[PDB]
Amino acid sequence: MSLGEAFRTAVYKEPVMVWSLMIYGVGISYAAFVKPSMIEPPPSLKEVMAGIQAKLNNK
Amino acid sequence: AKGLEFVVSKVDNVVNWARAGSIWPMTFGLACCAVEMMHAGASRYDLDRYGIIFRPSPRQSDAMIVAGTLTNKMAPALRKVYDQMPEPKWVVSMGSCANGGGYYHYSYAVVRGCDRVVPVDVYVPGCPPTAEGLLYGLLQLQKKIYRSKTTQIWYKK
Amino acid sequence: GTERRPGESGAWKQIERQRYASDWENDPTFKRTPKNLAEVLDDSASMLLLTDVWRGMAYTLGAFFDKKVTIMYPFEKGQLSPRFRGEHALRRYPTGEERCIACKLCEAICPAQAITIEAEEREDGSRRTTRYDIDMTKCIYCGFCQEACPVDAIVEGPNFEFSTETREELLYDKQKLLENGDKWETEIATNLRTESLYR
Amino acid sequence: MFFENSAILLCALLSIAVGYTKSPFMSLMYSVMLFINSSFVLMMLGFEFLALVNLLVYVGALAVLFLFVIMLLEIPATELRAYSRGWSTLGIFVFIINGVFQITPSMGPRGIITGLPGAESITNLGHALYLYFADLLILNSLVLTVALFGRFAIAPV
Amino acid sequence: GWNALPSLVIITGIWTAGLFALDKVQMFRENKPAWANNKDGWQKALYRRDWYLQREEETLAMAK
Amino acid sequence: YNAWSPAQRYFVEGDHVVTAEASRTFQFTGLDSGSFYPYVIATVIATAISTVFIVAPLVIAPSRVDLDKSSAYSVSFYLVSIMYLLFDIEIAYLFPYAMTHASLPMYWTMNLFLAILVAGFAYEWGMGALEWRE
Amino acid sequence: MIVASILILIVPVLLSVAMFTLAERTVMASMQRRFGPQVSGISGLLQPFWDGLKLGVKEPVLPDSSSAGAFAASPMISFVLSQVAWVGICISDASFQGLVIMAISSLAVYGVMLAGWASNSKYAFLGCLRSVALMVSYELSLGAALLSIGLFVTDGTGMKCLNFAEMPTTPQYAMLPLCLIFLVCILAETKRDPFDLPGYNVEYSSLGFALFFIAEYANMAVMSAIASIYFLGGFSALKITALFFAFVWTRGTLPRYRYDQFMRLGWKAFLPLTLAFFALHASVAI
Amino acid sequence: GLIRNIATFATAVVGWSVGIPFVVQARMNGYVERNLATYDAAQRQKAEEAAIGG
Amino acid sequence: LTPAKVNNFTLNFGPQVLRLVLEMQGEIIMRADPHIGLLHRGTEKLLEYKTYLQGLPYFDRLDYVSMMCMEHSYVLAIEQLLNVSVPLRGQYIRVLFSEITRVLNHLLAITCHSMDVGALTPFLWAFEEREKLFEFYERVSGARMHAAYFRVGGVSQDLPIGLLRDVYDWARQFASRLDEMEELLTGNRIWKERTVDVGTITAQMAWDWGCSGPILRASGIDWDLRKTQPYDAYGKMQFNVPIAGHGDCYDRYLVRLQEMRESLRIIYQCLNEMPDGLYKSPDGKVCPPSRSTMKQSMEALIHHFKLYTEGFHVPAGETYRAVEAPKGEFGVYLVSRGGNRPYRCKIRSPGYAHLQMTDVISRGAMLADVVTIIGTLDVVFGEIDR
Numbered sequence A: 001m002s003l004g005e006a007f008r009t010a011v012y013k014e015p016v017m018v019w020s021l022m023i024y025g026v027g028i029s030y031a032a033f034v035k036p037s038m039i040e041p042p043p044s045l046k047e048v049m050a051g052i053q054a055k056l057n058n059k
Numbered sequence B: 001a002k003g004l005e006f007v008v009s010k011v012d013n014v015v016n017w018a019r020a021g022s023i024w025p026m027t028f029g030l031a032c033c034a035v036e037m038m039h040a041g042a043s044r045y046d047l048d049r050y051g052i053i054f055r056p057s058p059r060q061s062d063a064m065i066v067a068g069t070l071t072n073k074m075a076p077a078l079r080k081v082y083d084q085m086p087e088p089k090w091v092v093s094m095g096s097c098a099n100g101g102g103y104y105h106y107s108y109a110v111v112r113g114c115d116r117v118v119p120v121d122v123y124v125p126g127c128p129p130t131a132e133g134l135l136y137g138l139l140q141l142q143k144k145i146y147r148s149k150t151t152q153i154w155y156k157k
Numbered sequence C: 001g002t003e004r005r006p007g008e009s010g011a012w013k014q015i016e017r018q019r020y021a022s023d024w025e026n027d028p029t030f031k032r033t034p035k036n037l038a039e040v041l042d043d044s045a046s047m048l049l050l051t052d053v054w055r056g057m058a059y060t061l062g063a064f065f066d067k068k069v070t071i072m073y074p075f076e077k078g079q080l081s082p083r084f085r086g087e088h089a090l091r092r093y094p095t096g097e098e099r100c101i102a103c104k105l106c107e108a109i110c111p112a113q114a115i116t117i118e119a120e121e122r123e124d125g126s127r128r129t130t131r132y133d134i135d136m137t138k139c140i141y142c143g144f145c146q147e148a149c150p151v152d153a154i155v156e157g158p159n160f161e162f163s164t165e166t167r168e169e170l171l172y173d174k175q176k177l178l179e180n181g182d183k184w185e186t187e188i189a190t191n192l193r194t195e196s197l198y199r
Numbered sequence D: 001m002f003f004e005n006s007a008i009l010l011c012a013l014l015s016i017a018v019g020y021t022k023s024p025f026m027s028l029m030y031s032v033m034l035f036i037n038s039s040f041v042l043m044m045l046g047f048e049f050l051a052l053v054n055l056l057v058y059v060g061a062l063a064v065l066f067l068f069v070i071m072l073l074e075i076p077a078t079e080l081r082a083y084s085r086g087w088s089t090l091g092i093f094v095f096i097i098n099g100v101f102q103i104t105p106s107m108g109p110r111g112i113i114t115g116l117p118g119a120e121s122i123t124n125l126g127h128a129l130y131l132y133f134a135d136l137l138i139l140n141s142l143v144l145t146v147a148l149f150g151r152f153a154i155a156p157v
Numbered sequence E: 001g002w003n004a005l006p007s008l009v010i011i012t013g014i015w016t017a018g019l020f021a022l023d024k025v026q027m028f029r030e031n032k033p034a035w036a037n038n039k040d041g042w043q044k045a046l047y048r049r050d051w052y053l054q055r056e057e058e059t060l061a062m063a064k
Numbered sequence F: 001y002n003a004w005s006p007a008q009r010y011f012v013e014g015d016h017v018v019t020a021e022a023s024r025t026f027q028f029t030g031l032d033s034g035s036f037y038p039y040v041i042a043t044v045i046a047t048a049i050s051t052v053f054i055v056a057p058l059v060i061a062p063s064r065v066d067l068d069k070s071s072a073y074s075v076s077f078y079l080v081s082i083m084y085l086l087f088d089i090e091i092a093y094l095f096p097y098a099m100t101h102a103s104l105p106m107y108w109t110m111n112l113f114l115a116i117l118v119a120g121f122a123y124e125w126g127m128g129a130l131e132w133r134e
Numbered sequence G: 001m002i003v004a005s006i007l008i009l010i011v012p013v014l015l016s017v018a019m020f021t022l023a024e025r026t027v028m029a030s031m032q033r034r035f036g037p038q039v040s041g042i043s044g045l046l047q048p049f050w051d052g053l054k055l056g057v058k059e060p061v062l063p064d065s066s067s068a069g070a071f072a073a074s075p076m077i078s079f080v081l082s083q084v085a086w087v088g089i090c091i092s093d094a095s096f097q098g099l100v101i102m103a104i105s106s107l108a109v110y111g112v113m114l115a116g117w118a119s120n121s122k123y124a125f126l127g128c129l130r131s132v133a134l135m136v137s138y139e140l141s142l143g144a145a146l147l148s149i150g151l152f153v154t155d156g157t158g159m160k161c162l163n164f165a166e167m168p169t170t171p172q173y174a175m176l177p178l179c180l181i182f183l184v185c186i187l188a189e190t191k192r193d194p195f196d197l198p199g200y201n202v203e204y205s206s207l208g209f210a211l212f213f214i215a216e217y218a219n220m221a222v223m224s225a226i227a228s229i230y231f232l233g234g235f236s237a238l239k240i241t242a243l244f245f246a247f248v249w250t251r252g253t254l255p256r257y258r259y260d261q262f263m264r265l266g267w268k269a270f271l272p273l274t275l276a277f278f279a280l281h282a283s284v285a286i
Numbered sequence H: 001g002l003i004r005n006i007a008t009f010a011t012a013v014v015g016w017s018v019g020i021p022f023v024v025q026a027r028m029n030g031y032v033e034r035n036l037a038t039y040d041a042a043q044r045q046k047a048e049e050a051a052i053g054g
Numbered sequence I: 001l002t003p004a005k006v007n008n009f010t011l012n013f014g015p016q017v018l019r020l021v022l023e024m025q026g027e028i029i030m031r032a033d034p035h036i037g038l039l040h041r042g043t044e045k046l047l048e049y050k051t052y053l054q055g056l057p058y059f060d061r062l063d064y065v066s067m068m069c070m071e072h073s074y075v076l077a078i079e080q081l082l083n084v085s086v087p088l089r090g091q092y093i094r095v096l097f098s099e100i101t102r103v104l105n106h107l108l109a110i111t112c113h114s115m116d117v118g119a120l121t122p123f124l125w126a127f128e129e130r131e132k133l134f135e136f137y138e139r140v141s142g143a144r145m146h147a148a149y150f151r152v153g154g155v156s157q158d159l160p161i162g163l164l165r166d167v168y169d170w171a172r173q174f175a176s177r178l179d180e181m182e183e184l185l186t187g188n189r190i191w192k193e194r195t196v197d198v199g200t201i202t203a204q205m206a207w208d209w210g211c212s213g214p215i216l217r218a219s220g221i222d223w224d225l226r227k228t229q230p231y232d233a234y235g236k237m238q239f240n241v242p243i244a245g246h247g248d249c250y251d252r253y254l255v256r257l258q259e260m261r262e263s264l265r266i267i268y269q270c271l272n273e274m275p276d277g278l279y280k281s282p283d284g285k286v287c288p289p290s291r292s293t294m295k296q297s298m299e300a301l302i303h304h305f306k307l308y309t310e311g312f313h314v315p316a317g318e319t320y321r322a323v324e325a326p327k328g329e330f331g332v333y334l335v336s337r338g339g340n341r342p343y344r345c346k347i348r349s350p351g352y353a354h355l356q357m358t359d360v361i362s363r364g365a366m367l368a369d370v371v372t373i374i375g376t377l378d379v380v381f382g383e384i385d386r
């Protein structure tokens, strides 16, 4: 049988474990590949506070 | 002194109020009268409306209602459970089988009335009595409890 | 639904059988296997997210906002019929004389042996009872006494709230039975005016 | 600081009491109390997280299994020489030498130390666990697996 | 359910009264509506320094 | 607790402060942040309440002596309790990781821990150890 | 002051537990086409009070063949744990307050076990263990759910903690399966349907029985407050009452499971799901 | 003796809590005295070293 | 011949009226030894001192859940030896009220089984319709449970006018009540997992174990006494037979529900076919006459005197008759010597036979399922202990 038949029979005979493993796989995949692609990309105290003021004052 | 007596009387009133309105019996599914008893706690009559809860143990049981015939083989067990009832306790006799034997009064293995084994406070007649009659009998039990005056007795002891 | 599933069987022999034999598949009463992504999602929605508890929950909740059948005894009573067999009672004639003539049919027919009768001729020559006792703690309220009596003397009255604190109060004598009959005569006569078309 | 020092002293008292009594249930109860009070006193050292870890683990997990094993394996054998055979004098004498007068203490030549409250950082603890002792964390994982597999292989069937 | 509705309202009212009373009592005790905030050793140090400074001010208050 | 050194009192000298600390009021915003102190007093109060409720029915209830009134009317547990032990220890291991801003290699090591955990757990699953027929 | 605050917390707990059992009775009646307690006081607004006073005046009976000290203390211990849990709910500032309450709830298992060994009842001996094993098994999943919750609990200073006042004032729409599994675990923790198979206090009586029920319903309310704080985005009376209403709703509509059945369910469906969700939340929150 | 057990337990607890501190403080007194003697001996040693070392 | 030696396991399951002693090697039941007789009232010997009419109320309290069915078997056993034909209208009334009684027995049984399992709502819900049918009983016999309505040659009284109206009105919504009853357990995974594949019974064992009623039907067995050995007007009635093939508690549950459906169908058919005519057999020498007839005729007065004192004399002989009881097959063996009292009256109870299956069925099960076994067995100790 192909992937489809075995997956169907397994999920019918045991859906919870397949759900758990699929969620784990999605998390692992997002950590490994998805995240480092689209979301991954000495000043003194006065500069930091000035930047904080600039960010806060407009909002 | 009169004020202390008045306080004693009011406390007795409150004690009777509490004990009457929260009587928890124990279930002896002996015979016919239990079905009337089961229907008495049902939606139409709502024994629970009158502060009545059936408990699995004698230890929380307040009084005993005998719903069904009592045999000689069952009498020691009934005395066992009643002797497990804590004080203050009462007994309610429902059904002629429980009353005096009734339709098995001349049998060889039937205890002619549960009176012969345990004391009884309320005798409810009928074979079977109406669930309405059981309501009336338990209300009369409440009336008997109302007339009780324990701390009044104890203060004059 | 009434369908069955693998793993939902509550045993070990059957569970061990179905996880190691496809015998349940041959059974048509078992829900058939999902065949596509849609059916798999339907099965997942069936198992997870409940969706079976939800229906009974909703029906019970509708019952919460629903009406009730509860009655407020003693300020409300139930429904009963004239044929009701309650407290035994002794009836008289409208002039005032006892209906019972001590034919002892009631005692003869009573399978409870709860009726004790003694009688002799009255000073006027009338055949009247000297002792008329019925053991209510022994009476089974069958009404066979009411069936046997040919003068409508003994009747089971519409009184059913007559519980006593002591058992001795239920040892009914002639006097208390006559008192009960004089009390409840009108209701019993009215019921007989209906029951006569059947009895 | 009377009560804090009293709680500190209670630890060794309970420790001796654990072996002192003959009822296994009493010993386990003493151990549970000792664990709780130990965690509470260590809380005075500023370890909120570690105290809860110790509490959770030992009370919820280990003591429960202790009581279960005892309850499935111990008919009362207290009179079975547990009171009639007594205790070895050499053991208590050695224990006195070791712990009452403590000829060989932990500090050795030092006789006084200052106890000072700490500052538990779960952030620093995590940094250490997963950056400085990650290898030991994996070794602990292997040890947990050893325990699980050995237990399930030593099953009495 | 009209019979249970009184109990339903009473439970909510009881919890409301209890929470309001506890709010008032703890506000009187702590004198700021943030005492439940998470605090590290830094905030603890600031709080204890401030308390000791208030005590020092009282000590120097009874000197003029 | 009461301070015993001026360094602990931030080098503030005087007698007023010592007595003030001696009879201070408890305040989370005062000197006892994260103190856990109300737990003990709650324990005392609950002990008192429970003891009183135990004692009271022995006072306001009649007593009668009866002989018969003084009478009462597996490894799956082993498996479950020992598994609970190990898994709770593992949860305690996991807890600090959830309380930090961990990094990617830290994440991978955590996943390694979880992988070993689930490996043992799944081995127990596949061998019939989670089927509680016994 | 602190003692007074403890008592001010205590009073609504007892009063409301009385009201909870009364309203559970009455709502069960409403869902059963009956009225329920209505004679004992105005609309039956006095039933639990008289019940408590009645069990107070009822005679406490002690077996002569066991250790009565544990028999007395076990309901006492459970009541103490309930009071301590309430104090930690309302009168605490611990950094791991949720973990504190979890560890507290882990302790309530003993009272059932203490009672089970105490009395000389074989079926108590068995049911105590059954209930113990159920709650113990579900405790791991509850801790895993808290682990998942702790992955986003941050204060303004930037430190990750378990403080209740720093929990977001919004519901967590992104953990609905986690919320559902946590709610079912809460249902399991209180011996309620569909986990009311185990009672353990069968040989108990009087105010001991009253304290057992007090501890049970207080733990139920504690878990309700925990759930409201965690998933419902705050702590309020409305949410407590709604959760209790839903719990009565579930009790009045479902039958209970078998022992090994909910054992299998918890050990093969709930804990692995919580583990996977915890891993996913940790991965995304990075 | 349930109440007897309670009495014995409480008596043991109180006696322990009042007696152990005395022994602890006796240990502290002995150690302080010994360290004072040690420091005096070391001071005398340093004095002798200064005398015979020029 | 047998010592005790190894005590080891010991159990006591309930003085409170079933006493059960079980044997487990742990969590799984290996032996189960019920002890009965706590309700043995010795009625069979008591019957010998009563006339046939006197002993009739004894049969009310043998199965106080289902009464008229208990009356019917004894009445038929009397009549067959008496060679008495029953009028058509009486047969209609008997069959209809028997169906109502069967409905009551099924309702109470299923509700008690649910409460033992853990469902409390259907209990309360179905007791309302049970109260309705109790009102029906009281209207026709003046007694809620112990009617003593069935008589040798007919019934005591005719139906009061206006009864069938309310019967039809009740039937107009009993289906809705049953439907709302099903949704609480039918589509539930919990109810099934509690009930599915618990206490499996085969056809061969069942016929070896003497099963009757719904338990027999759930084993793939085609059997109804109302269709194989019909009595009274049951042959005219057209209705279906539910059939299951697992011998499961869930299967028995569904079988009982479908039996209730078929009972409702028979109730409708009886309602729309009620005939006009005599309700008692015209033999006054066995059947009592009318009170009006008694009070104006010497012969009827004499017969009322004799029957109500001595009763009719059954010819010497023997017979056994059974009735398709809601709990199975209820039969009574009658031994006649020729007098006005039955010489020997043996009573056969289906629950007593079903109760004998506990030890073999409870093997391999769990303590959570013993209560399931008892509840699905549908046993009343009144008939079990006579």
Ligand code: SF4
Binding pocket: B031, B032, B033, B034, B067, B068, B069, B094, B095, B096, B097, B098, B102, B103, B126, B127, B128, B129, I061, I064
């Ligand atoms: S009094 Fe009558 S109805 Fe009640 S249990 Fe006895 S025989 Fe049955």
Ligand code: SF4
Binding pocket: C099, C100, C101, C102, C103, C104, C105, C106, C107, C148, C149, C150, C151, C152, C153, C154
């Ligand atoms: S009551 Fe009627 S039947 Fe009985 S003795 Fe009197 S007249 Fe005869």
Ligand code: SF4
Binding pocket: C088, C109, C110, C111, C112, C114, C115, C134, C138, C139, C140, C141, C142, C143, C144, C145, C146, C156
């Ligand atoms: S009603 Fe029945 S038991 Fe009562 S007196 Fe009449 S015949 Fe006897």
